[PDB]
Scaffold this active site. Sequence first.
Site, PDB file in Angstrom:
ATOM      1  N   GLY B  27       0.823  -1.189   0.000  1.00 26.39           N
ATOM      2  CA  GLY B  27       0.000   0.000   0.000  1.00 26.39           C
ATOM      3  C   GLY B  27       0.863   1.248   0.000  1.00 26.39           C
ATOM      4  O   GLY B  27       2.093   1.177  -0.082  1.00 26.39           O
ATOM      5  N   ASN B  28       0.197   2.396   0.099  1.00 28.73           N
ATOM      6  CA  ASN B  28       0.892   3.675   0.163  1.00 28.73           C
ATOM      7  C   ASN B  28       0.160   4.578   1.149  1.00 28.73           C
ATOM      8  O   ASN B  28      -0.959   4.280   1.578  1.00 28.73           O
ATOM      9  CB  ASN B  28       0.997   4.326  -1.217  1.00 28.73           C
ATOM     10  CG  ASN B  28      -0.373   4.634  -1.814  1.00 28.73           C
ATOM     11  OD1 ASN B  28      -1.092   5.499  -1.312  1.00 28.73           O
ATOM     12  ND2 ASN B  28      -0.732   3.936  -2.886  1.00 28.73           N
TER      13      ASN B  28
END
Lengths: 214, 223
Positions: B27-28
């Site tokens: 993810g980010n």
Amino acid sequence: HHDMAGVKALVTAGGTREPLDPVRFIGNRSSGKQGYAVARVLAQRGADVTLIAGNTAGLIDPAGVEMVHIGSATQLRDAVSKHAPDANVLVMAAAVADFRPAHVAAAKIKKPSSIDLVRNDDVLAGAVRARADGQLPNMRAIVGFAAETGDANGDVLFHARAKLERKGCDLLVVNAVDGWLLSADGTESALEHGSKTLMATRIVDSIAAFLKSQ
Amino acid sequence: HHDMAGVKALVTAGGTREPLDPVRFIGNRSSGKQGYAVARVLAQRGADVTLIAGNTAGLIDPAGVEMVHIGSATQLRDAVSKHAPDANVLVMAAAVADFRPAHVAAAKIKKGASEPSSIDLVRNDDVLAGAVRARADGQLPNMRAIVGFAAETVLFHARAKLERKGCDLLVVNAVGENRAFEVDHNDGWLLSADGTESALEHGSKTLMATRIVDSIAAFLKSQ
Ligand SMILES: Nc1ccn([C@@H]2O[C@H](COP(=O)(O)OP(=O)(O)OP(=O)(O)O)[C@@H](O)[C@H]2O)c(=O)n1
Ligand SMILES: Nc1ccn([C@@H]2O[C@H](COP(=O)(O)OP(=O)(O)OP(=O)(O)O)[C@@H](O)[C@H]2O)c(=O)n1
Ligand SMILES: O=C(c1ccc(O)cc1)c1ccc(O)c(O)c1O
Ligand SMILES: O=C(c1ccc(O)cc1)c1ccc(O)c(O)c1O
Ligand SMILES: O=C(c1ccc(O)cc1)c1ccc(O)c(O)c1O
Ligand SMILES: [Ca+2]
Ligand SMILES: [Ca+2]
């Protein structure tokens, strides 16, 4: 009542995030809600609670609980090592990443093929080994959490028991992916389904029973 | 003043999550707040807004906006291509994962004593460039403005990324919340495909969304 007065509790909750660069990480889907609930129920019943929290579903810092925030598994290990000496109870409800990227950039990676991984320390096993080597004389209960499923290698309870045995903690809270409370004395209690608060009440009750005996 | 009345806008917001197995993902750290603010400002100014949202469970749905929820970059791609042909404006504010794990495990991957395998990766489709491509090929007759977002640490790469993607407007460095102790890079720009650059003051997400929508509205009436 206040059947936890004087007891210092150290709780970990949420998932860790293992950075690749400032913006990207490896993470997991745990909400931390169950650990927060245990911390809240501990605090309500009179304990001095420190909560070490990683990634959470936008949860609110519970009332009257010292909050330590962390990002990665390594930072969670450091924070637990920091606060463990003062604790009477450790509740490892965090979903601790088992690996971290081998390299971490300081600036965003731009436009690669493969991410090398390195193993993270087992924080729960470390607390079990330290208490057994006389380094945590204040520690009276170490609690781990596990999500287990049955598969071609064994039914769900087989895998849950093996985990208790391998970790060596005093209590293993097992969610059957409802579930069980598995104690180091062999007792096995079904954990009736309910809300995060209600299941926290049964967990803390189990901790209380294990402390009043010891 | 409803300067976006009669405009159908499709907005994407939030980060994508690329699964490794049922519980782990890449993810980010995108919150999705800037895309939500653009979606909110568009609806406040009369647009009919559909919002495709990634990892944004903690945010409030903007009043008056149709929500579409997605997980991965590939689900975002399919949702955009499904909803793009009905829109007049596409605002690509999502932090779309450039890569995904090449194999998603069916069961939770168990740790062994063996040395950890790497994570092999494969590129995700460039969703913004797919929309530009589809418009150039005649499949988006209603599309009047395609807006991309970019972070570049500045005008050299911003004007370059503009021509590589081919969108109508590029919002560059609409990051931060003007939060205490966040460095203000003075890096914000609004670049138009028609040759306009405007500095983006690094204020609240709302003042930025207002500036972004002001530019979309001035680009549309330019046509
Ligand atoms: N590096 C780690 C990984 C896990 N845990 C703790 O150990 C317990 C069991 O975690 P679990 O994920 O079930 O077990 P693992 O031994 O990591 O094994 P696997 O994922 O292979 O099942 C949890 O209370 C968790 O907080 C930990 O302290 N340190
Ligand atoms: N797979 C992707 C990656 C990006 N974008 C869109 O493209 C724009 C800019 O993303 P950018 O950061 O330029 O991604 P890349 O072009 O891959 O470049 P970088 O390596 O700098 O991230 C954004 O509006 C984003 O929503 C997209 O639609 N699909
Ligand atoms: O085991 C993996 C994993 C390895 C390879 C793959 O294709 C998918 C997952 C893992 C990676 C990062 C992490 O943080 C973690 O906890 C993990 O278990
Ligand atoms: O850019 C990277 C990346 C590449 C190599 C590395 O060591 C660390 C990160 C990336 C990795 C996985 C992903 O899913 C993604 O979207 C990404 O952009
Ligand atoms: O990028 C797109 C795409 C993006 C926007 C749009 O309006 C239409 C298509 C895409 C969709 C499906 C696919 O299979 C593919 O390879 C793709 O690149
Ligand atoms: Ca694990
Ligand atoms: Ca990108």
